[PDB]
């Protein structure tokens, strides 16, 4: 076991109060849910809108890397 658990550092709640606390915290916990994936869509990416000199090193380190990085 190496999950980081909730800790009650001070106080000793009765089981009813532990249940109220955990129910409220679990209702507050929200948003991401399961780890869905944002699908890759490079259409109209900002790096493609920039002017690069024909010999710009940013063609390698910015443009190409942005397209290739996965």
């Amino acid at each position: 076991d190496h999950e980081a658990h909730i800790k009650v550092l001070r106080g000793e709640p009765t089981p009813e109060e532990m249940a109220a606390l955990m129910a409220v915290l679990a209702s507050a916990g929200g948003g991401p849910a399961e780890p869905v994936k944002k699908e890759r869509n490079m259409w109209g990416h900002p790096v493609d809108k920039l002017r690069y000199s024909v010999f710009s090193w940013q063609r390698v380190t910015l443009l190409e890397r942005t397209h290739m990085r996965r």
Partner: peptide, 18 residues
């Protein structure tokens, strides 16, 4: 799992809380 003063305490909850 919750720790309370160093006690472990399992709490079981529904999978669908907000």
């Amino acid at each position: 799992v919750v720790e309370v003063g160093g006690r472990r305490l399992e709490v079981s909850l529904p999978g669908d809380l907000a």
